[PDB]
mmCIF file of N, CA and C in Angstrom:
data_model
loop_
_atom_site.group_PDB
_atom_site.id
_atom_site.type_symbol
_atom_site.label_atom_id
_atom_site.label_comp_id
_atom_site.label_asym_id
_atom_site.label_seq_id
_atom_site.Cartn_x
_atom_site.Cartn_y
_atom_site.Cartn_z
ATOM 1 N N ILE A 1 0.859 -1.181 0.000
ATOM 2 C CA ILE A 1 0.000 0.000 0.000
ATOM 3 C C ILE A 1 0.895 1.230 0.000
ATOM 4 N N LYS A 2 0.399 2.329 -0.568
ATOM 5 C CA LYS A 2 1.176 3.554 -0.666
ATOM 6 C C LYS A 2 0.720 4.645 0.299
ATOM 7 N N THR A 3 -0.510 4.589 0.810
ATOM 8 C CA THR A 3 -1.015 5.649 1.682
ATOM 9 C C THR A 3 -1.953 5.064 2.729
ATOM 10 N N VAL A 4 -2.165 5.838 3.793
ATOM 11 C CA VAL A 4 -3.145 5.540 4.834
ATOM 12 C C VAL A 4 -3.879 6.835 5.157
ATOM 13 N N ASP A 5 -5.202 6.763 5.307
ATOM 14 C CA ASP A 5 -6.029 7.952 5.464
ATOM 15 C C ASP A 5 -6.941 7.835 6.679
ATOM 16 N N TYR A 6 -7.273 8.987 7.265
ATOM 17 C CA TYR A 6 -8.182 9.024 8.407
ATOM 18 C C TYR A 6 -9.027 10.290 8.360
ATOM 19 N N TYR A 7 -10.161 10.252 9.057
ATOM 20 C CA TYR A 7 -11.174 11.299 8.997
ATOM 21 C C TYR A 7 -11.390 11.938 10.363
ATOM 22 N N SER A 8 -11.992 13.125 10.338
ATOM 23 C CA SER A 8 -12.410 13.853 11.533
ATOM 24 C C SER A 8 -13.516 14.816 11.130
ATOM 25 N N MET A 9 -14.279 15.287 12.114
ATOM 26 C CA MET A 9 -15.376 16.192 11.798
ATOM 27 C C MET A 9 -15.692 17.095 12.981
ATOM 28 N N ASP A 10 -16.301 18.241 12.680
ATOM 29 C CA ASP A 10 -16.631 19.266 13.656
ATOM 30 C C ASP A 10 -17.823 20.067 13.149
ATOM 31 N N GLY A 11 -18.485 20.778 14.062
ATOM 32 C CA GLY A 11 -19.596 21.629 13.703
ATOM 33 C C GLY A 11 -19.624 22.877 14.564
ATOM 34 N N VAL A 12 -20.320 23.901 14.065
ATOM 35 C CA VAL A 12 -20.345 25.209 14.712
ATOM 36 C C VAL A 12 -21.756 25.782 14.727
ATOM 37 N N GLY A 13 -21.925 26.840 15.511
ATOM 38 C CA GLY A 13 -23.215 27.496 15.654
ATOM 39 C C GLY A 13 -23.173 28.466 16.816
ATOM 40 N N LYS A 14 -24.260 29.229 16.955
ATOM 41 C CA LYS A 14 -24.360 30.261 17.982
ATOM 42 C C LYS A 14 -25.803 30.387 18.460
ATOM 43 N N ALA A 15 -25.971 30.891 19.686
ATOM 44 C CA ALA A 15 -27.277 31.091 20.310
ATOM 45 C C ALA A 15 -27.469 32.568 20.616
ATOM 46 N N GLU A 16 -28.670 33.081 20.366
ATOM 47 C CA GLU A 16 -28.983 34.488 20.581
ATOM 48 C C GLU A 16 -30.374 34.654 21.178
ATOM 49 N N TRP A 17 -30.590 35.814 21.796
ATOM 50 C CA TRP A 17 -31.891 36.178 22.343
ATOM 51 C C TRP A 17 -32.772 36.696 21.211
ATOM 52 N N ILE A 18 -34.027 36.259 21.180
ATOM 53 C CA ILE A 18 -34.953 36.604 20.110
ATOM 54 C C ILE A 18 -36.165 37.300 20.709
ATOM 55 N N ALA A 19 -36.770 38.195 19.931
ATOM 56 C CA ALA A 19 -38.018 38.827 20.330
ATOM 57 C C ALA A 19 -39.203 37.922 19.999
ATOM 58 N N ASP A 20 -40.353 38.248 20.579
ATOM 59 C CA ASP A 20 -41.573 37.468 20.375
ATOM 60 C C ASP A 20 -41.954 37.254 18.911
ATOM 61 N N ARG A 21 -42.243 38.336 18.194
ATOM 62 C CA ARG A 21 -42.635 38.223 16.789
ATOM 63 C C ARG A 21 -41.603 38.795 15.821
ATOM 64 N N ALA A 22 -40.619 37.971 15.468
ATOM 65 C CA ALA A 22 -39.569 38.412 14.526
ATOM 66 C C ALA A 22 -38.969 37.101 14.016
ATOM 67 N N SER A 23 -37.978 37.208 13.134
ATOM 68 C CA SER A 23 -37.510 36.152 12.249
ATOM 69 C C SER A 23 -36.016 35.879 12.380
ATOM 70 N N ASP A 24 -35.386 36.543 13.342
ATOM 71 C CA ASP A 24 -33.931 36.544 13.486
ATOM 72 C C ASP A 24 -33.508 35.383 14.376
ATOM 73 N N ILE A 25 -33.443 34.189 13.802
ATOM 74 C CA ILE A 25 -32.999 33.018 14.551
ATOM 75 C C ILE A 25 -31.716 32.492 13.921
ATOM 76 N N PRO A 26 -30.692 32.176 14.708
ATOM 77 C CA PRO A 26 -29.415 31.748 14.130
ATOM 78 C C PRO A 26 -29.409 30.276 13.765
ATOM 79 N N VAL A 27 -28.500 29.871 12.876
ATOM 80 C CA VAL A 27 -28.459 28.495 12.395
ATOM 81 C C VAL A 27 -27.118 27.844 12.707
ATOM 82 N N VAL A 28 -27.040 26.529 12.506
ATOM 83 C CA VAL A 28 -25.846 25.744 12.785
ATOM 84 C C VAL A 28 -25.268 25.243 11.468
ATOM 85 N N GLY A 29 -24.015 24.790 11.526
ATOM 86 C CA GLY A 29 -23.343 24.274 10.357
ATOM 87 C C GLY A 29 -22.417 23.127 10.708
ATOM 88 N N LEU A 30 -22.123 22.311 9.694
ATOM 89 C CA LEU A 30 -21.335 21.100 9.855
ATOM 90 C C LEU A 30 -20.107 21.153 8.956
ATOM 91 N N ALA A 31 -19.197 20.202 9.163
ATOM 92 C CA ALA A 31 -17.999 20.084 8.343
ATOM 93 C C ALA A 31 -17.385 18.703 8.539
ATOM 94 N N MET A 32 -16.504 18.330 7.612
ATOM 95 C CA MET A 32 -15.779 17.068 7.671
ATOM 96 C C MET A 32 -14.339 17.330 7.247
ATOM 97 N N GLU A 33 -13.501 16.297 7.332
ATOM 98 C CA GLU A 33 -12.065 16.490 7.182
ATOM 99 C C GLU A 33 -11.362 15.150 7.007
ATOM 100 N N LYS A 34 -10.319 15.157 6.172
ATOM 101 C CA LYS A 34 -9.530 13.970 5.871
ATOM 102 C C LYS A 34 -8.045 14.311 5.936
ATOM 103 N N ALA A 35 -7.229 13.314 6.286
ATOM 104 C CA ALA A 35 -5.790 13.496 6.420
ATOM 105 C C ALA A 35 -5.068 12.220 6.007
ATOM 106 N N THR A 36 -3.778 12.375 5.695
ATOM 107 C CA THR A 36 -3.013 11.385 4.945
ATOM 108 C C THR A 36 -1.627 11.193 5.556
ATOM 109 N N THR A 37 -1.086 9.986 5.380
ATOM 110 C CA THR A 37 0.315 9.683 5.645
ATOM 111 C C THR A 37 0.734 8.544 4.721
ATOM 112 N N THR A 38 2.042 8.383 4.525
ATOM 113 C CA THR A 38 2.569 7.524 3.467
ATOM 114 C C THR A 38 3.451 6.409 4.030
ATOM 115 N N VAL A 39 3.815 5.473 3.149
ATOM 116 C CA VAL A 39 4.581 4.278 3.500
ATOM 117 C C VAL A 39 5.638 4.045 2.426
ATOM 118 N N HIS A 40 6.870 3.747 2.840
ATOM 119 C CA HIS A 40 7.997 3.551 1.928
ATOM 120 C C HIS A 40 8.622 2.171 2.120
ATOM 121 N N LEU A 41 9.635 1.878 1.300
ATOM 122 C CA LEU A 41 10.264 0.565 1.236
ATOM 123 C C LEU A 41 11.779 0.697 1.319
ATOM 124 N N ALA A 42 12.417 -0.251 2.009
ATOM 125 C CA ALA A 42 13.861 -0.279 2.204
ATOM 126 C C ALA A 42 14.331 -1.729 2.173
ATOM 127 N N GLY A 43 15.638 -1.937 2.321
ATOM 128 C CA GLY A 43 16.149 -3.295 2.311
ATOM 129 C C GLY A 43 17.599 -3.403 2.720
ATOM 130 N N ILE A 44 17.988 -4.626 3.084
ATOM 131 C CA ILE A 44 19.372 -4.957 3.406
ATOM 132 C C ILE A 44 19.613 -6.448 3.187
ATOM 133 N N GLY A 45 20.739 -6.791 2.557
ATOM 134 C CA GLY A 45 21.084 -8.160 2.253
ATOM 135 C C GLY A 45 22.557 -8.434 2.507
ATOM 136 N N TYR A 46 23.073 -9.451 1.812
ATOM 137 C CA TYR A 46 24.462 -9.861 2.002
ATOM 138 C C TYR A 46 24.976 -10.571 0.756
ATOM 139 N N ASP A 47 26.236 -11.002 0.815
ATOM 140 C CA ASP A 47 26.882 -11.663 -0.314
ATOM 141 C C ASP A 47 28.136 -12.378 0.175
ATOM 142 N N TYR A 48 28.690 -13.225 -0.688
ATOM 143 C CA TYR A 48 29.933 -13.912 -0.353
ATOM 144 C C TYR A 48 30.570 -14.475 -1.616
ATOM 145 N N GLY A 49 31.874 -14.751 -1.526
ATOM 146 C CA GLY A 49 32.607 -15.353 -2.620
ATOM 147 C C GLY A 49 32.476 -16.864 -2.638
ATOM 148 N N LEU A 50 33.148 -17.483 -3.610
ATOM 149 C CA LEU A 50 33.010 -18.925 -3.780
ATOM 150 C C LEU A 50 33.887 -19.702 -2.807
ATOM 151 N N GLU A 51 35.159 -19.336 -2.681
ATOM 152 C CA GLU A 51 36.061 -20.034 -1.778
ATOM 153 C C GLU A 51 36.045 -19.453 -0.372
ATOM 154 N N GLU A 52 35.174 -18.481 -0.107
ATOM 155 C CA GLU A 52 34.896 -18.048 1.256
ATOM 156 C C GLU A 52 33.902 -18.976 1.936
ATOM 157 N N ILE B 1 50.617 -25.794 31.172
ATOM 158 C CA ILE B 1 50.550 -24.807 30.123
ATOM 159 C C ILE B 1 51.062 -23.480 30.666
ATOM 160 N N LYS B 2 51.517 -22.605 29.765
ATOM 161 C CA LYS B 2 51.972 -21.283 30.169
ATOM 162 C C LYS B 2 51.153 -20.152 29.563
ATOM 163 N N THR B 3 50.108 -20.456 28.789
ATOM 164 C CA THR B 3 49.202 -19.432 28.285
ATOM 165 C C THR B 3 47.781 -19.978 28.219
ATOM 166 N N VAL B 4 46.825 -19.054 28.195
ATOM 167 C CA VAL B 4 45.399 -19.342 28.081
ATOM 168 C C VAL B 4 44.796 -18.324 27.125
ATOM 169 N N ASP B 5 43.951 -18.786 26.203
ATOM 170 C CA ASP B 5 43.452 -17.968 25.104
ATOM 171 C C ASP B 5 41.930 -17.929 25.090
ATOM 172 N N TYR B 6 41.373 -16.783 24.695
ATOM 173 C CA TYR B 6 39.926 -16.653 24.564
ATOM 174 C C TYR B 6 39.581 -15.729 23.398
ATOM 175 N N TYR B 7 38.360 -15.897 22.886
ATOM 176 C CA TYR B 7 37.927 -15.370 21.599
ATOM 177 C C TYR B 7 36.773 -14.388 21.748
ATOM 178 N N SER B 8 36.623 -13.522 20.745
ATOM 179 C CA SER B 8 35.447 -12.666 20.647
ATOM 180 C C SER B 8 35.194 -12.327 19.185
ATOM 181 N N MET B 9 33.956 -11.940 18.881
ATOM 182 C CA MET B 9 33.545 -11.684 17.506
ATOM 183 C C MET B 9 32.605 -10.488 17.453
ATOM 184 N N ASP B 10 32.506 -9.882 16.270
ATOM 185 C CA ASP B 10 31.639 -8.723 16.082
ATOM 186 C C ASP B 10 31.297 -8.593 14.605
ATOM 187 N N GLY B 11 30.398 -7.660 14.298
ATOM 188 C CA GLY B 11 29.972 -7.449 12.927
ATOM 189 C C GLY B 11 29.308 -6.105 12.751
ATOM 190 N N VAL B 12 29.268 -5.637 11.500
ATOM 191 C CA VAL B 12 28.740 -4.321 11.165
ATOM 192 C C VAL B 12 27.880 -4.399 9.910
ATOM 193 N N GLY B 13 27.042 -3.382 9.740
ATOM 194 C CA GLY B 13 26.155 -3.293 8.590
ATOM 195 C C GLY B 13 25.311 -2.038 8.681
ATOM 196 N N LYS B 14 24.536 -1.800 7.621
ATOM 197 C CA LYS B 14 23.705 -0.605 7.525
ATOM 198 C C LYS B 14 22.582 -0.822 6.520
ATOM 199 N N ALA B 15 21.396 -0.308 6.848
ATOM 200 C CA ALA B 15 20.213 -0.404 6.005
ATOM 201 C C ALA B 15 19.919 0.935 5.340
ATOM 202 N N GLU B 16 19.310 0.878 4.154
ATOM 203 C CA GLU B 16 19.077 2.075 3.354
ATOM 204 C C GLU B 16 17.766 1.940 2.591
ATOM 205 N N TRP B 17 17.280 3.072 2.079
ATOM 206 C CA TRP B 17 16.062 3.121 1.279
ATOM 207 C C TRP B 17 16.368 2.777 -0.173
ATOM 208 N N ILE B 18 15.470 2.006 -0.797
ATOM 209 C CA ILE B 18 15.660 1.567 -2.213
ATOM 210 C C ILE B 18 14.519 2.109 -3.078
ATOM 211 N N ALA B 19 14.438 1.648 -4.331
ATOM 212 C CA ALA B 19 13.394 2.097 -5.284
ATOM 213 C C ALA B 19 12.493 0.919 -5.674
ATOM 214 N N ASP B 20 12.451 0.583 -6.968
ATOM 215 C CA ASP B 20 11.595 -0.529 -7.467
ATOM 216 C C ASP B 20 12.402 -1.422 -8.418
ATOM 217 N N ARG B 21 12.808 -0.879 -9.569
ATOM 218 C CA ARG B 21 13.602 -1.641 -10.571
ATOM 219 C C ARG B 21 15.090 -1.311 -10.421
ATOM 220 N N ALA B 22 15.527 -0.972 -9.204
ATOM 221 C CA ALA B 22 16.948 -0.628 -8.964
ATOM 222 C C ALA B 22 17.630 -1.736 -8.155
ATOM 223 N N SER B 23 18.959 -1.660 -8.032
ATOM 224 C CA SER B 23 19.755 -2.651 -7.261
ATOM 225 C C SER B 23 20.816 -1.907 -6.441
ATOM 226 N N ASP B 24 20.455 -1.472 -5.230
ATOM 227 C CA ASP B 24 21.365 -0.714 -4.377
ATOM 228 C C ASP B 24 21.501 -1.315 -2.989
ATOM 229 N N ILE B 25 21.028 -2.536 -2.787
ATOM 230 C CA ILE B 25 20.857 -3.103 -1.456
ATOM 231 C C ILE B 25 22.213 -3.274 -0.783
ATOM 232 N N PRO B 26 22.366 -2.844 0.475
ATOM 233 C CA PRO B 26 23.684 -2.884 1.122
ATOM 234 C C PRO B 26 23.984 -4.191 1.842
ATOM 235 N N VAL B 27 25.277 -4.498 1.976
ATOM 236 C CA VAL B 27 25.767 -5.752 2.537
ATOM 237 C C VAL B 27 26.298 -5.545 3.952
ATOM 238 N N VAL B 28 26.617 -6.644 4.644
ATOM 239 C CA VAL B 28 27.105 -6.634 6.022
ATOM 240 C C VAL B 28 28.471 -7.317 6.075
ATOM 241 N N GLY B 29 29.103 -7.304 7.255
ATOM 242 C CA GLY B 29 30.408 -7.930 7.424
ATOM 243 C C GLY B 29 30.693 -8.282 8.871
ATOM 244 N N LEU B 30 31.765 -9.064 9.080
ATOM 245 C CA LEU B 30 32.085 -9.639 10.390
ATOM 246 C C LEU B 30 33.591 -9.561 10.656
ATOM 247 N N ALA B 31 33.986 -9.860 11.901
ATOM 248 C CA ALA B 31 35.392 -9.879 12.314
ATOM 249 C C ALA B 31 35.523 -10.604 13.655
ATOM 250 N N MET B 32 36.768 -10.944 14.022
ATOM 251 C CA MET B 32 37.063 -11.707 15.239
ATOM 252 C C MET B 32 38.345 -11.205 15.903
ATOM 253 N N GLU B 33 38.597 -11.698 17.124
ATOM 254 C CA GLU B 33 39.733 -11.263 17.934
ATOM 255 C C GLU B 33 40.077 -12.308 18.995
ATOM 256 N N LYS B 34 41.333 -12.256 19.468
ATOM 257 C CA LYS B 34 41.914 -13.213 20.411
ATOM 258 C C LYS B 34 42.657 -12.488 21.532
ATOM 259 N N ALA B 35 42.687 -13.101 22.725
ATOM 260 C CA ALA B 35 43.422 -12.562 23.867
ATOM 261 C C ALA B 35 44.016 -13.694 24.703
ATOM 262 N N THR B 36 45.021 -13.354 25.520
ATOM 263 C CA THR B 36 45.899 -14.339 26.153
ATOM 264 C C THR B 36 46.292 -13.911 27.567
ATOM 265 N N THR B 37 46.523 -14.911 28.428
ATOM 266 C CA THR B 37 47.091 -14.732 29.766
ATOM 267 C C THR B 37 48.112 -15.834 30.032
ATOM 268 N N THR B 38 48.878 -15.694 31.115
ATOM 269 C CA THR B 38 50.018 -16.565 31.389
ATOM 270 C C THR B 38 49.895 -17.266 32.741
ATOM 271 N N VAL B 39 50.679 -18.337 32.899
ATOM 272 C CA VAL B 39 50.650 -19.208 34.072
ATOM 273 C C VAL B 39 52.079 -19.425 34.558
ATOM 274 N N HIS B 40 52.294 -19.326 35.872
ATOM 275 C CA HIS B 40 53.632 -19.383 36.454
ATOM 276 C C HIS B 40 53.690 -20.397 37.592
ATOM 277 N N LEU B 41 54.908 -20.670 38.066
ATOM 278 C CA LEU B 41 55.178 -21.752 39.007
ATOM 279 C C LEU B 41 55.812 -21.213 40.283
ATOM 280 N N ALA B 42 55.495 -21.845 41.413
ATOM 281 C CA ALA B 42 55.961 -21.449 42.735
ATOM 282 C C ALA B 42 56.157 -22.706 43.578
ATOM 283 N N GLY B 43 56.725 -22.547 44.770
ATOM 284 C CA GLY B 43 56.982 -23.711 45.598
ATOM 285 C C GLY B 43 57.234 -23.367 47.047
ATOM 286 N N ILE B 44 57.202 -24.413 47.873
ATOM 287 C CA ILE B 44 57.532 -24.338 49.293
ATOM 288 C C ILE B 44 57.842 -25.754 49.771
ATOM 289 N N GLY B 45 58.615 -25.865 50.848
ATOM 290 C CA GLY B 45 59.001 -27.181 51.319
ATOM 291 C C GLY B 45 59.423 -27.136 52.768
ATOM 292 N N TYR B 46 60.240 -28.115 53.154
ATOM 293 C CA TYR B 46 60.775 -28.160 54.510
ATOM 294 C C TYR B 46 62.011 -29.048 54.562
ATOM 295 N N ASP B 47 62.687 -29.025 55.708
ATOM 296 C CA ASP B 47 63.878 -29.835 55.913
ATOM 297 C C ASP B 47 64.019 -30.160 57.395
ATOM 298 N N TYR B 48 64.842 -31.164 57.690
ATOM 299 C CA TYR B 48 65.029 -31.573 59.076
ATOM 300 C C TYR B 48 66.279 -32.431 59.220
ATOM 301 N N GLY B 49 66.855 -32.410 60.422
ATOM 302 C CA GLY B 49 68.020 -33.221 60.700
ATOM 303 C C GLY B 49 67.658 -34.628 61.133
ATOM 304 N N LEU B 50 68.688 -35.449 61.341
ATOM 305 C CA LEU B 50 68.457 -36.862 61.630
ATOM 306 C C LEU B 50 68.090 -37.074 63.096
ATOM 307 N N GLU B 51 68.970 -36.674 64.007
ATOM 308 C CA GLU B 51 68.636 -36.849 65.411
ATOM 309 C C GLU B 51 67.542 -35.901 65.881
ATOM 310 N N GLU B 52 67.228 -34.839 65.136
ATOM 311 C CA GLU B 52 66.039 -34.052 65.464
ATOM 312 C C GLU B 52 64.768 -34.870 65.279
#
């Protein structure tokens, strides 16, 4: 595999005082999020001669 | 015997990052060693006369 991914999420909003007959009410909102990290390859071996 | 011998060994190597269709893989190696001590002689005795 070449990558690994993970998610996170958050939301926001506010509260306010409202009058009896009016229309000014606040709303909320959402969001999501993704993040990444990677994976690499390495190695180590050996060797020898014939009369060794 | 007048000497006593003992042995020791060690080795080295290193790992590295490679690619895909390449050939760069690193090798390892070894070595040995010897040490010595000595042995010596001592004595004690006694003597006595005849009529003693």
